[PDB]
Amino acid sequence: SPEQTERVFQISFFNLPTVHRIRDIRSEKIGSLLSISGTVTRTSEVRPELYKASFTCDMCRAIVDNVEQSFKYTEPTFCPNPSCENRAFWTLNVTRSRFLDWQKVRIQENANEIPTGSMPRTLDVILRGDSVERAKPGDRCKFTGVEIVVPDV
Amino acid sequence: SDEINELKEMVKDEHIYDKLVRSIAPAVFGHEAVKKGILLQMLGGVHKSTVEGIKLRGDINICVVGDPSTSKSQFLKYVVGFAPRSVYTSGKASSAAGLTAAVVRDDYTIEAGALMLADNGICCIDEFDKMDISDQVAIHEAMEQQTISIAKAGIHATLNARTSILAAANPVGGRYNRKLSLRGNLNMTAPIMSRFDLFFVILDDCNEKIDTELASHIVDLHMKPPFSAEQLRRYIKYARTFKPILTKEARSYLVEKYKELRKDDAQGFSRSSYRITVRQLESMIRLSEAIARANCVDEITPSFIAEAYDLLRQSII
Amino acid sequence: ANEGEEGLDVFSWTEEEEREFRKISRDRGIIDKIISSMAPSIYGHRDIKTAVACSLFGGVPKNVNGKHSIRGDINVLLLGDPGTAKSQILKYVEKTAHRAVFATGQGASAVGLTAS
Amino acid sequence: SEIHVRISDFPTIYSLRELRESNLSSLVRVTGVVTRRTGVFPQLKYVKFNCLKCGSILGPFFQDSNEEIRISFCTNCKSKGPFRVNGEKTVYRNYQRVTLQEAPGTVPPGRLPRHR
Amino acid sequence: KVDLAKIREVAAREDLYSLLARSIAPSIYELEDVKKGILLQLFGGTNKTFRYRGDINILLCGDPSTSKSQILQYVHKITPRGVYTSGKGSSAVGLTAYITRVLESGALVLSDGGVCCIDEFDKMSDSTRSVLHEVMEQQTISIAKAGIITTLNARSSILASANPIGSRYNPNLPVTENIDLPPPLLSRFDLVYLVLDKVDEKNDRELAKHLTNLYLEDVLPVEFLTMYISYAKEHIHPIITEAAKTELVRAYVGMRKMTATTRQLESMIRLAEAHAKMKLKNVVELEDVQEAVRLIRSAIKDKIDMNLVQTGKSVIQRKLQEDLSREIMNVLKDQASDSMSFNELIKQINEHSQDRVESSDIQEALSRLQQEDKVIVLGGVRRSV
Amino acid sequence: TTLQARCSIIAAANPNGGRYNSTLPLAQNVSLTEPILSRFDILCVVRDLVDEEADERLATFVVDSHVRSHPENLNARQRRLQRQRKKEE
Ligand SMILES: Nc1ncnc2c1ncn2[C@@H]1O[C@H](COP(=O)(O)OP(=O)(O)O)[C@@H](O)[C@H]1O
Ligand SMILES: Nc1ncnc2c1ncn2[C@@H]1O[C@H](COP(=O)(O)OP(=O)(O)O)[C@@H](O)[C@H]1O
Ligand SMILES: [Zn+2]
Ligand SMILES: [Zn+2]
């Protein structure tokens, strides 16, 4: 077994004192530990995220690895070889880079907390790592984790 | 750790059969034979695959016929809320197609029917008499071959649906008539009647003592059991782990008792077996396997086949 | 469900299999062996097994001078009482034929068959 | 000119629902039904191009049938230029995409299929 | 935009029954049994689990000109939770959960513990009857569409108002066969109220005078009713005593030997539970049991003869089967072939056997004989054996 | 479009009333008409007749098949193939 990578430890914090509704979600508490009860409408394909990325320079074949992609696919700017002056045209290393599972499940609030004459508000929930394919659509279910904000890619 | 010792003290009991036929549906008063049949549906037979590729049904299908106040639907609620992978449905209609897979424009896709959602489980069907003719001809393949084959427009497939059927069908035209035959009171035809494993006729008789005891019992569940539900589930799953095997004397008793069954169904001059078929022979071997699973033994005694023939003799009249 | 056929094409053959075919084809009574071996899990029904063997092997389609066409396949109807294992023969032909399509009841449309 | 090998009977069968990140860059055995099949298309097995400003030609690069070969520069000039296919050495191979939907008897009952 | 002592002071009065009975519908003077049935639906039974539904169900059978949609509007305004909908307006799977755009679900799950008031209840489609069958029985809707399986708790009390076909209907022949609704729905309604009545010029002058008194001139308040139901439904938990079960079982014995089912008994149980919920005593006394027996007795005033089957039709079907067997025997004596045309044989059977009946009854008896396999049908052709 | 569908059609039908009548001809036994019956080359009629000895051998065969097809009856795959061939001989 020659291939040995760093283990991607995932930390799960459950049993919060309170649970939030989708209607109760405000933007003042992003990056905070929240628990949300809801019903999944549809689930997405278990797809690979580019978690840790490695790239090669096309000029001098220098290697830059551990590039982190937050929300868009990014390439390194400065070539680490001081003799080379490359700025663009970086080739991705598919084998060397480390990937993670991704799933985007879309949830809405339950029919018990839906008020009179309202369409249900929706929310996208990201499952990564071990938690992929755990939630099936149409189930009353509680997700505990992080409220995040995503930009227009 | 304690549950395996509890299971060990279950399997060494002297009267396992009576405890298991009394533990099924404790809220429902009476009808111990229907509880025995429902228990045998929860245990069931073993699936067999012949080396010629021919599949043999291991599932058990009960039809319960009775007056409009006989707690057939209470049995249906008990089986749905108790047994895993169980689906309640109405036989008359449902949203889109019920009990059948439907094609949907979105290019067509398959919506699973209530038979498909009860995969390796129990599909409790209410109002089974007024079911649709497409549902009739899909059930005609769905019981035995355990598949529904749909070839519509651009999409063709076969869909495996391993499902044991519990149905509760009211007699058409009112209550059950005791003078008529059991075939006369139901809307089903011959082949779908022969596809059912066993039948249970229950009547709403009008006597003083039975009515007073039933009424006191049903008010005794309003603000007033040999095995618990988890205990029953553990023992039933342990019986599902058993795969019983036959003996030679069991084969001899089964062929002689199939001779006795085949003799007694003669329709006079026509020499026609209107109800007793080979499906009754597969019914007897499935009920013998279920009863051998009930006592948690690996072999079928000829007494088990005798009890199975007693069950078919109760269902035949 | 059988995991014993190891290969990309189950209906393919090797040269030794062709030699065994030529060996067993010259045996007198191979017709009765094929008929008795067709659906082995079903007892009796010699007419059914013979008709299924005839439909499964089939005749020869003919083209006369580029002007006339003769159908070569054989279509077999099984009419019978329930509980006579009519559908298990159909499932055996599904296992046995090189290409096999199934349809039943109201679930087969007019354009689910033919083409749409 | 070239021979190809079809590897048969991989002992691990993975459905489309069970594919994860650990199975990338590896052989997978997938059961599924084909719904959409495109036509036969010729594809350049080796792509080569002519730089217009320089006399040197770009070397032939093998096509991986996933993404086009990214031409950052030329072998004589270190900048992008006009590139078009030379007829000196061209090799064509067949290419066809199929939409492999999961089989409806394989999926959990009532769920959605997966497309790869 | 745009305490509980008031509950306790009317809880101690002994005249709160007629007070709340005239408070719910002050405009309608008659049908006090109808308003007390709707009142006991607002109170309802307790949610029991170990599950049985505690809510009573009311179907109003009456003429459209007789005021019933006013009562539906009033029970909509009184209730804390509840939705008024029209039967002609919503059908198919509209009243239950349907996939749109998300899952936009209907009123049968949005009104948990409340009243769903369906006007023009005769125009339910067959899919909607099948949905409503598990609404009454399972108190839980369940669908499986677009990869979404949902099992949603209905737990709703239904109030329906039905329309007879065309004219008002005579009381001599039973009214239930006029109503287009299937008898599986009628067997699950706890209370049916015949709103049909005839003019007798007694209070119709009073109705016209007080109806014009809103033009000539300009009991508990509705908000007090709303908080009273909201306090009674969750903060009050009645219990069943061992004493009242004896009067319950002898009342059921009296009903059965008069005609009754065990659904009627369990309706008495939940009705007495709802009356104890109204009285805020947290105990089921004697009096609510006899009140529930009286109300269900008045409902059955209007061997159960359900499934839209009267025993006279149930015996004349077999009589026509015997007459068709005799006609087939006469045809077999006349000719060797037993196959005959349906119209000519039906006309001969109608002319020769007995008085004139429907032509559908003879072919229904022949379909019965198809089920018993005595006679074979082709198509038509009817071959006797 | 003139497609080719060289199909061998194997159909399984039922008689009228659920059971075949031996004293009646084939035409009113089936719900099929003359042209759909006319293309079919071999039409196998099966009658479930009660016999004192055919039911015996049929019952013995079916019970022995249920015994034989039960799951509880040099490597693993080689001996599995060997015992499957021994079972099917
Ligand atoms: N013997 C009994 N024991 C317990 N409950 C009963 C019994 N008989 C009737 N019931 C109650 O009465 C109801 C009878 O309804 P049921 O006969 O199932 O209607 P249907 O015949 O239309 O399905 C059930 O819900 C059940 O709770
Ligand atoms: N030799 C046989 N003759 C008749 N039936 C058999 C025989 N062997 C097995 N069977 C039974 O026939 C059943 C399948 O019958 P099927 O073809 O579905 O009936 P139908 O002909 O009404 O469709 C199987 O469950 C099997 O147990
Ligand atoms: Zn560089
Ligand atoms: Zn260049």
- Asked whether the beta carbons of residue C83 and residue B277 sit closer than 8 angstroms, the reply is yes
- Tell me the C-alpha distance between E247 and E237, whole Å: 22
Structure tokens at F24: 């009646």
Which residue from E33, E24, E139 is spatially nearest to B73, judged by alpha carbons? Answer: E139
Whose Cα sits closest to atom 25 in ligand 2?
Answer: B56
Interface test with E, best of F14, F16, F21, F33 (most E CBs within 10 A): F16
Give the three-class secondary structure for D105.
coil
Contact F17 E381 (CB under 8 A): no
Q: What are phi and psi of F22, to 5 degrees?
A: -75, -30
Nearest CA to ligand 2 atom 18: C87
Query: Which atom of ligand 2 lies at the shortest distance from residue C45's CA?
Result: 1
User: B108 - beta bridge partners?
Assistant: B105
Residue of A nearest to E104 (CA): A119
A110–chain D nearest CA distance, Å: 20
> Which helix (H) or strand (E) element contains residue B143?
none
Interface check E105 vs A, CB under 8 A: yes
Q: How many CB atoms lie within 10 A of CB E51?
A: 14
Which of E245, E314, E320, E321 is the best substitution to test chain B (most B C-beta atoms within 10 A)?
E245
The DSSP secondary-structure symbol of E96 reads S
- A30-51 burial: b if 16+ Cβ within 10 Å, else e: eeeebbbbbbbbebeebebebb
Best residue among B74, B88, B216 to mutate for probing ligand 1's pocket (most ligand atoms within 8 Å of CB) is: B74
CA of E262 relative to ligand 1 center, distance in Å: 7
Give dist(CA F15, CA F21) in Å, integer: 8
Tell me how far apart the alpha carbons of residues E255 and E44 are, in angstroms, rounded to a whole number: 23
Phi/psi for E41 (5° steps) reads: -75, -40
> CB under 8 Å to B8, separation ≥6 — which residues?
none
Distance between CA atoms of residues D29 and E307, nearest Å: 56
Q: Please give the CATH number for the structural domain made up of A19-47+101-152.
A: 2.40.50.140
Contact F29 C80 (CB under 8 A): no
Task: Give E-chain residues touching B111 at CB under 8 angstroms.
Answer: 144-145
Q: Are B246 and F66 in contact (CB under 8 A)?
A: yes
DSSP string, E236-264: ------SSHHHHHHHHHHHHHT----HHH
Phi-psi region of A84 (alpha: psi -120 to 50; beta: other; left: phi over 0): beta
**Shortest CA distance to B282 belongs to which of B91, B47, B6?**
B47
Distance CA A124, CA A134 (A): 15
Q: Is B181 annotated as a binding residue?
A: no
How big, in percent rounded to 5, are the helix, strand and coil portions of chain C? 40, 10, 50
Phi, psi (deg, nearest 5) at residue D73: -150, -165
The reply to whether F45 touches chain C by the CB within 8 Å rule is yes
Structure tokens at E373: 């396999």
| Main-chain dihedrals φ then ψ at residue A36, nearest 5 degrees | -130, 125
Instruction: Confirm or reject: Cβ of B219 under 6 Å from ligand 1.
Output: no
Q: Which two tokens stand for residue A22?
A: 């989708």
Whether residue E370 and residue F18 make contact (CB cut-off 8 A), yes or no, is no
Place of tokens 């082949």: B191
Closest residue to A101, CB basis, from D17, D20, D70: D20
Ligand closest to the CA atom of residue B26: 1
The three-state secondary structure class of D76 is: coil
DSSP category for residue B51 = T
Chains that touch E (3 or more CB pairs under 8 A): A, B, D, F
- Measured from the CA of B57, which atom of ligand 2 is nearest? 25
- Which 3 state secondary structure label does DSSP give E148? strand
Six-digit token pair at A2? 């020659």
Is E66 annotated as ligand-binding?
yes
User: Are the beta carbons of C79 and F61 separated by less than 8 Å?
Assistant: no
Closest CA to C42 of C77, C81, C92, C82: C92
Q: Give yes or no for residue B57 CB within 6 A of ligand 2.
A: yes
Residue of A39, A111, A119 with shortest CB distance to E110: A111
Resolution in A: 3.7
E69 is in an annotated binding site: yes
The finding on whether C4 has its CB within 6 A of some atom of ligand 2 is no
Query: Residue E48: what residue type?
Result: K
Residues facing residue D92 across a β-bridge: D44
DSSP E310-331: -HHHHHHHHHHHHHHHHHHHHH
**Does residue E202 have a known ligand-binding role?**
no
Give the integer Cα–Cα distance in Å for B1 and B13. 20
Domain hosting residue D68, numbered range:
45-91
Q: Please give the Cα distance from E131 to B89 (Å, whole number).
A: 10
Hey, what amino acid is at B121?
G
Which of A43, A120, A138 lies at the smallest CB-CB distance from E102?
A: A120
Residue D55 CA to ligand 3 centre (angstroms): 26
- What fold is seen in the domain B1-317? Rossmann fold (3.40.50)
* Residue E298 CB neighbour total at 10 angstroms: 13
* Nearest chain B residue (CA) to F66: B48
Taking alpha carbons only, the member of D78, D80, D86, D88 closest to residue D50 is: D86
Tokens describing residue B115: 């038979």
CA–CA gap between residue F79 and residue F89 (Å, rounded): 15
Q: Where are the alpha helices (DSSP H) in chain E?
A: 5-11, 16-24, 32-43, 69-78, 107-110, 126-136, 183-186, 204-216, 222-235, 244-256, 262-279, 287-301, 311-334, 342-352, 359-371
- E6-15 long-range contacts, CB within 8 A, separation 24+: E6/E224, E7/E224, E7/E227, E7/E228, E7/E231, E7/E280, E10/E220, E10/E228, E11/E279, E11/E280
Find the ligand nearest to F18 CA.
Answer: 2
A/D interface, count of CB pairs below 8 Å: 27
Q: What is the DSSP string of F2-71?
A: --------EEEE--GGGS--TTS-HHHHSS--HHHHHS-SEEEEE--B--TTHHHHHHHHHHHHHHHT-S
CB-closest option in B191, B258, B263 to F14: B191
Buried/exposed A69-102: b ≥16 CB within 10 Å, e otherwise: eeeeeeebeebeeeeeebeeebeeeeeebbbbbb
At E64 the three-state DSSP class reads coil
Maximal C-alpha separation, chain A? 69
The CA-atom distances, in angstroms, between B229 and each of B17, B26, B79 are: 17, 10, 11
Cα angle E351-E352-E356, degrees, rounded to a multiple of 5 = 45
The reply to whether residue D112 touches residue A42, judged by beta carbons under 8 angstroms, is yes
Residue B23 near residue B226, CB atoms below 8 Å: yes
Token look-up 């269902």 returns: B315
Whether residue E268 contacts residue E284, with contact meaning beta carbons closer than 8 Å, is answered with no
Interface of chain A toward chain D, CB-CB under 8 angstroms: 42-43, 45-46, 48, 58, 89, 91, 94-95, 99-101, 132-133, 136-137
Ligand 1: does its nearest atom lie under 6 Å from the Cβ of B295? no
Q: Is the CB of B70 inside a 6 Å radius of any atom of ligand 1?
A: yes
Residue showing tokens 């035949």: B316
Element (H or E) spanning D42, and its range? strand D41-44
Distance E192 CA to ligand 1 centre (A): 20
User: Two tokens at E190?
Assistant: 């706890």
Q: Which residues of B touch F66 (CB under 8 A)?
A: 48, 56, 246, 282, 285
Q: What are φ and ψ of residue B126, in 5° steps?
A: -105, 150
Q: Are E54 and E273 in contact (CB under 8 A)?
A: yes
Regarding chains F and A, contact by 3 or more CB pairs under 8 A is answered as no
Cβ-based neighbours of A118, under 8 Å, separated by 6 or more: none
Which amino acid makes up residue C78? L
Verify whether ligand 2 is closer than 6 Å to residue C46 (CB atom).
Answer: no
CA dist B76 → B120, B228, B298 (Å): 17, 19, 30
Contact state of A122 with E102 under an 8 Å Cβ cutoff? yes
Strand order across the beta sheet in which F42-46 lies: F10-13, C76-80, F42-46
Instruction: Give Cα separations from D69 to B97, D47, D65, D77, E218 (angstroms).
Output: 50, 8, 10, 18, 87
